[PDB]
Amino acid sequence: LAAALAQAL
Numbered sequence: 001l002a003a004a005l006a007q008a009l
C-alpha cells in the first residue's frame, strides 16, 4: 500500500 502511493513521488 505505501508503495502504491509512493509512486506519486
Ligand SMILES: *C(=O)c1ccc(-c2ccc(C(=O)OCC)cn2)nc1
Pocket: 001, 002, 003, 004, 005
Ligand atoms: C503497497 O503498496 C505494497 C506494495 C508491495 C508490497 C510488497 C511487499 C513484499 C514484497 C516482496 O517481494 O516480499 C518478499 C518477502 C513485494 N511487495 N507491499 C505493500
Ligand SMILES: *NNC(=O)c1ccc(-c2ccc(C(N)=O)cn2)nc1
Pocket: 006, 007, 008, 009
Ligand atoms: N515517485 N517516484 C519516482 O519518482 C521514482 C521514479 C523512478 C524510480 C526508479 C527506481 C529504481 C529504478 C531502477 N532501475 O532500479 C528506476 N527508477 N523510483 C522512484
Ligand SMILES: CCc1ccccc1
Pocket: 009
Ligand atoms: C513536487 C515537488 C517535490 C518533488 C519531489 C519530492 C517532493 C516534492
Ligand SMILES: Cc1ccc(C)cc1
Pocket: 003, 006, 007, 009
Ligand atoms: C515507489 C518508489 C520507490 C522508490 C523511491 C525512492 C520512491 C518511490
